[PDB]
Amino acid sequence: DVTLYGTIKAGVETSRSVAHHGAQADRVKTATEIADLGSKIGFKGQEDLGNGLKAIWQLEQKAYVSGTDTGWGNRQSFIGLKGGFGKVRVGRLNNILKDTGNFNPWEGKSYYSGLSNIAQPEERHVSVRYDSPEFAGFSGSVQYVPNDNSGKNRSESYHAGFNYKNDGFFVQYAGSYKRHNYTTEKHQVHRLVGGYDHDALYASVAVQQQDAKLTWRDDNSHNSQTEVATTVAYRFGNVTPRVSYAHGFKGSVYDADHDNTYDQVVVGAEYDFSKRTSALVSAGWLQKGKGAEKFVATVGGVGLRHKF
Amino acid sequence: DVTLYGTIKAGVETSRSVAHHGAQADRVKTATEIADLGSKIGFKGQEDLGNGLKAIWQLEQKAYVSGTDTGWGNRQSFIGLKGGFGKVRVGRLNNILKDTGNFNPWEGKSYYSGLSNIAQPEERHVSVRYDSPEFAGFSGSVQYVPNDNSGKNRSESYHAGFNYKNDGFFVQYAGSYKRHNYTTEKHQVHRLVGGYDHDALYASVAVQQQDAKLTWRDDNSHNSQTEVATTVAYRFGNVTPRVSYAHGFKGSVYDADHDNTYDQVVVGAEYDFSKRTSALVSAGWLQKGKGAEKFVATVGGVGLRHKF
Amino acid sequence: DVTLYGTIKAGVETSRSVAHHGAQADRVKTATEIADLGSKIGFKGQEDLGNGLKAIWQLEQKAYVSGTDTGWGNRQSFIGLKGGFGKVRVGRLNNILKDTGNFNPWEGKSYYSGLSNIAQPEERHVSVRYDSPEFAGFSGSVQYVPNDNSGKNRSESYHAGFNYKNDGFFVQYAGSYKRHNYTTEKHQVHRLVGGYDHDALYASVAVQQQDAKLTWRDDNSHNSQTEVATTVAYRFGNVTPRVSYAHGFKGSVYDADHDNTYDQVVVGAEYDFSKRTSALVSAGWLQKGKGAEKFVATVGGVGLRHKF
Numbered sequence: 001d002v003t004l005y006g007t008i009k010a011g012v013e014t015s016r017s018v019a020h021h022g023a024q025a026d027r028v029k030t031a032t033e034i035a036d037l038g039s040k041i042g043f044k045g046q047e048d049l050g051n052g053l054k055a056i057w058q059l060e061q062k063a064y065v066s067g068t069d070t071g072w073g074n075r076q077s078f079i080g081l082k083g084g085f086g087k088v089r090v091g092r093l094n095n096i097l098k099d100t101g102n103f104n105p106w107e108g109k110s111y112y113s114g115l116s117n118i119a120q121p122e123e124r125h126v127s128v129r130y131d132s133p134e135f136a137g138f139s140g141s142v143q144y145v146p147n148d149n150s151g152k153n154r155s156e157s158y159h160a161g162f163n164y165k166n167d168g169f170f171v172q173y174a175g176s177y178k179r180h181n182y183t184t185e186k187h188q189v190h191r192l193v194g195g196y197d198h199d200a201l202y203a204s205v206a207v208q209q210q211d212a213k214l215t216w217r218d219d220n221s222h223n224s225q226t227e228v229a230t231t232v233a234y235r236f237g238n239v240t241p242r243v244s245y246a247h248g249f250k251g252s253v254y255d256a257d258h259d260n261t262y263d264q265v266v267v268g269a270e271y272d273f274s275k276r277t278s279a280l281v282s283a284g285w286l287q288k289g290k291g292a293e294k295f296v297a298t299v300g301g302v303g304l305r306h307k308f
Numbered sequence: 309d310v311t312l313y314g315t316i317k318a319g320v321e322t323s324r325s326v327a328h329h330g331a332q333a334d335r336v337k338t339a340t341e342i343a344d345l346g347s348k349i350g351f352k353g354q355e356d357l358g359n360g361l362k363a364i365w366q367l368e369q370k371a372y373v374s375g376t377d378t379g380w381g382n383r384q385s386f387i388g389l390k391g392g393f394g395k396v397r398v399g400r401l402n403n404i405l406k407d408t409g410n411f412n413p414w415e416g417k418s419y420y421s422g423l424s425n426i427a428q429p430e431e432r433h434v435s436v437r438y439d440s441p442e443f444a445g446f447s448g449s450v451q452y453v454p455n456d457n458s459g460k461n462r463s464e465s466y467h468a469g470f471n472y473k474n475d476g477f478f479v480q481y482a483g484s485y486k487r488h489n490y491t492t493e494k495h496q497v498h499r500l501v502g503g504y505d506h507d508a509l510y511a512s513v514a515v516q517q518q519d520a521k522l523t524w525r526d527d528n529s530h531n532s533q534t535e536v537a538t539t540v541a542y543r544f545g546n547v548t549p550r551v552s553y554a555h556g557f558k559g560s561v562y563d564a565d566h567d568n569t570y571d572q573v574v575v576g577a578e579y580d581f582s583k584r585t586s587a588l589v590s591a592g593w594l595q596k597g598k599g600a601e602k603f604v605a606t607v608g609g610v611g612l613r614h615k616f
Numbered sequence: 617d618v619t620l621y622g623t624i625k626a627g628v629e630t631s632r633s634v635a636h637h638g639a640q641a642d643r644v645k646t647a648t649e650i651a652d653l654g655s656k657i658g659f660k661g662q663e664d665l666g667n668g669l670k671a672i673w674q675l676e677q678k679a680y681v682s683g684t685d686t687g688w689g690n691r692q693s694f695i696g697l698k699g700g701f702g703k704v705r706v707g708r709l710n711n712i713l714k715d716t717g718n719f720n721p722w723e724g725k726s727y728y729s730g731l732s733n734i735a736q737p738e739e740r741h742v743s744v745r746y747d748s749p750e751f752a753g754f755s756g757s758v759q760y761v762p763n764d765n766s767g768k769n770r771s772e773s774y775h776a777g778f779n780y781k782n783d784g785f786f787v788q789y790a791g792s793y794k795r796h797n798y799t800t801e802k803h804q805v806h807r808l809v810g811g812y813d814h815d816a817l818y819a820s821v822a823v824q825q826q827d828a829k830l831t832w833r834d835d836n837s838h839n840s841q842t843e844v845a846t847t848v849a850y851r852f853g854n855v856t857p858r859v860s861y862a863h864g865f866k867g868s869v870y871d872a873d874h875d876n877t878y879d880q881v882v883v884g885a886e887y888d889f890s891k892r893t894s895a896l897v898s899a900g901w902l903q904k905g906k907g908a909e910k911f912v913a914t915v916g917g918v919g920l921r922h923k924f
């Protein structure tokens with residue numbers, strides 16, 4: 001039971017930025033490039049005989065067709081076991097926020113297809129993860145990121161979530177907390193996702209908040225941020241139109257509020273010539289801040305993806 | 309239809325340089341090393357069902373048995389389609405000048421087996437390529453190298469060639485032009501190759517010229533260069549003697565033309581124990597310039613190559 | 617006859633150091649981390665038809681599940697041939713001292729599982745190796761490490777050993793000499809290993825000495841070191857207890873000998889769920905020097921290893 005797998009997707013990005021300059025000016029420009037969209041390669045397997053138990057391992061890395069890259073196992077790679085009790089695994093592994101993540105499936109490039117600012121804390125760390133099996137559509141998992149920090153007060157972080165799916169219907173909580181980080185102190189991220197996922201239709205609303213203690217010097221400082229996003233995919237024959245909106249908020253206080261708010265949106269589709277082979281078309285838009293000091297950006301492109 | 313493939317070739321290089329010296333100067337020396345000769349690995353495939361169309365993808369990278377290396381998809385790797393209309397493909401891809409290139413098949417190392425100075429503009433860039441199918445021995449292709457440069461005046465470059473083969477007979481034009489480059493404004497490279505390739509015999513003469521505008525500070529400055537090369541390979545049983553000459557002429561300008569001319573030559577053979585497994589033996593020689601300030605170099609070695 | 621193979625092993629390391637101090641100094645601390653234990657990936661093969669001869673090639677590289685890594689063929693990778701006469705092979709290849717090495721099979725991490733200081737000269741160099749076939753349990757091999765050094769007086773090194781195995785019984789001499797090194801003029805390393813290896817029991821004693829000329833200013837300067845180690849492994853059902861001791865002696869010369877001596881030991885086991893899948897447990901201890909300026913360290917951990 002050895003398997004070699006992966007996916008290759010690439011194509012062109014036409015992109016533009018409008019940098020404001022309301023106060024003290026200039027507005028930069030289009031960049032148009034050939035870009036490998038998240039391409040990558042993996043090997044992996046499982047063994048039995050063995051028992052009710054099975055051994056699982058994987059090694060996956062970034063394979064850029066464009067070859068802007070380097071390295072091994074910078075993808076999700078691990079070793080672990082699954083059994084009556086589910087899977088325990090270790091090594092480079094996905095954030096519990098990273099594996100909700102289903103509401104943000106935009107094949108993308110050096111500049112965001114979308115929806116990014118909301119997916120900023122979706123990571124891979126060298127860590128440990130338990131994922132409990134299903135019971136009545138129920139699931140849960142937990143993750144430790146020791147690395148490493150003792151040493152000082154621990155920058156190890158802490159990850160877990162649960163997932164319900166009942167009849168094409170779902171919600172997923174994912175959360176992260178961090179005992180310490182420099183250029184920060186104990187930091188928290190929370191996400192709930194819910195929607196229908198099934199039969200040629202998908203819709204989801206997700207909400208993430210992050211509450212953070214701050215300024216290890218100039219205490220007590222702190223910030224909160226909040227983001228919403230929503231996505232509707234659908235399908236027929238081979239085409240799969242999809243759309244997403246994301247509004248992040250700013251925060252308050254610190255002595256000053258402003259509005260650090262952002263809005264962004266994406267639409268595009270997929271045309272399956274086959275299961276594996278899908279043509280991709282994508283157009284996003286985003287705006288940071290508002291008024292005289294502010295920002296806008298607009299991306300679009302095509303791409304191919306062949307999964308194997 | 310997945311495939312893993314590649315080739316491994318390595319072996320020893322004995323090398324020497326004679327650096328010419330009106331003194332204050334000196335003549336450097338032999339270096340003798342174990343060297344991986346162009347060794348590398350690849351995966352790739354194609355899909356149908358599908359249609360008259362097929363999906364092609366490849367990921368190939370430098371695999372040094374000597375491991376002086378790093379990375380992924382720094383070989384020719386891509387994604388594209390073939391069909392009635394031929395192949396369109398994208399990602400890291402070979403120059404049109406790089407895919408004539410048949411006249412220079414000397415497995416080589418850190419220093420020049422040969423024939424190098426004439427193969428200097430044979431590249432791989434992240435780009436787009438169309439290769440039209442065969443009609444009556446006829447073929448053609450085109451390539452865009454956007455990356456990236458707008459930004460400023462575009463350093464994107466431009467590549468295409470055609471190929472005729474009739475009855476073990478061939479000619480290949482390949483050409484490159486560059487809208488911009490820092491230290492060469494608007495630069496051009498042209499190559500014609502012709503010869504017999506077939507049935508245990510190969511002979512070819514190829515000619516490349518490069519005409520270049522020069523902005524360095526320099527307006528109006530400019531240079532031309534020209535290179536000829538010729539190669540005769542032949543075969544029996546398992547041995548495949550081969551030989552190559554290359555004479556470049558000078559960059560001609562600046563009130564002393566001088567002579568920047570160079571001459572170089574290579575001979576060696578191949579002994580197939582099988583299709584895949586061939587023992588390689590090679591000796592080159594080169595000379596740059598002439599007279600009191602000048603250069604000479606002499607290389608030779610063995611190696612093995614097993615293709616898979 | 618192509619083969620993809622490798623092994624994945626990872627897990628946790630709890631570690632501690634006691635650094636001895638009149639102070640300026642102090643006694644440092646535990647570090648506890650998830651660590652990929654020597655994990656890695658390879659491809660390779662052989663061909664015939666061919667003859668009594670066969671072609672062998674391999675490309676193996678470090679694959680860290682933890683992905684602290686980079687690169688290709690930094691493992692043992694080569695090309696060569698085997699036949700009546702045995703194997704000649706080239707490329708990145710294992711030191712003759714490296715392939716005795718059977719007495720030190722502790723899956724390990726960034727800090728030593730064990731037994732390290734004795735395995736310090738077990739290497740891979742870009743080089744050439746002949747390994748003669750078996751005759752009456754007899755074997756031999758020789759290695760040249762040219763790279764590269766002429767240039768100056770040659771830092772190429774020199775490697776060979778022999779191996780006897782008769783009825784679960786063995787001894788292996790491995791030796792290394794180096795014509796030059798900056799940090800060693802003309803350096804030598806010798807190892808004998810002997811023991812029973814067979815049928816669920818393994819025991820070995822090995823001895824290494826290294827005699828070295830020292831050029832720095834110092835002529836004539838020089839040092840000798842000596843190290844002993846011993847290992848007992850055994851097996852039942854699926855568990856495989858093992859233990860190892862290593863005592864190095866000092867460099868002794870130059871009017872003050874001191875004692876640069878060190879002692880270290882390791883114990884732990886393996887539990888095969890299968891041939892491939894083994895759970896690993898390990899505890900080592902080491903001490904450098906003695907007295908008021910000195911050192912101690914203690915490591916322990918678990919890990920999984922799945923070979924493929």
Ligand SMILES: Nc1ncnc2c1ncn2[C@@H]1O[C@H](COP(=O)(O)OP(=O)(O)OP(=O)(O)O)[C@@H](O)[C@H]1O
Pocket residue numbers: 037038039042060076107108
């Ligand atoms: N660090 C990263 N940088 C860029 N893109 C990423 C990163 N992490 C994840 N991605 C993108 O997220 C996608 C995950 O979606 P998909 O379901 O296709 O794969 P996946 O489930 O992550 O695969 P695996 O389970 O092996 O990680 C990847 O294909 C990749 O395009």
Ligand SMILES: Nc1ncnc2c1ncn2[C@@H]1O[C@H](COP(=O)(O)OP(=O)(O)OP(=O)(O)O)[C@@H](O)[C@H]1O
Pocket residue numbers: 345346347368383384
């Ligand atoms: N960066 C490089 N510069 C010059 N020559 C190279 C370079 N990389 C590879 N080569 C050599 O060019 C030779 C061309 O031979 P070959 O046709 O087998 O490969 P290729 O056509 O480039 O590969 P592909 O099947 O991916 O198109 C190869 O043997 C390879 O070792």
Ligand SMILES: Nc1ncnc2c1ncn2[C@@H]1O[C@H](COP(=O)(O)OP(=O)(O)OP(=O)(O)O)[C@@H](O)[C@H]1O
Pocket residue numbers: 653654655674676692693710
């Ligand atoms: N640079 C290194 N640092 C630490 N440990 C290493 C290093 N190189 C090899 N090892 C360990 O030594 C062990 C050697 O055992 P093994 O026989 O499996 O490999 P090998 O013989 O070196 O490779 P090959 O199968 O290609 O001959 C490996 O398990 C490996 O993890």
Ligand SMILES: [Mg+2]
Pocket residue numbers: 007038107
């Ligand atoms: Mg994807």
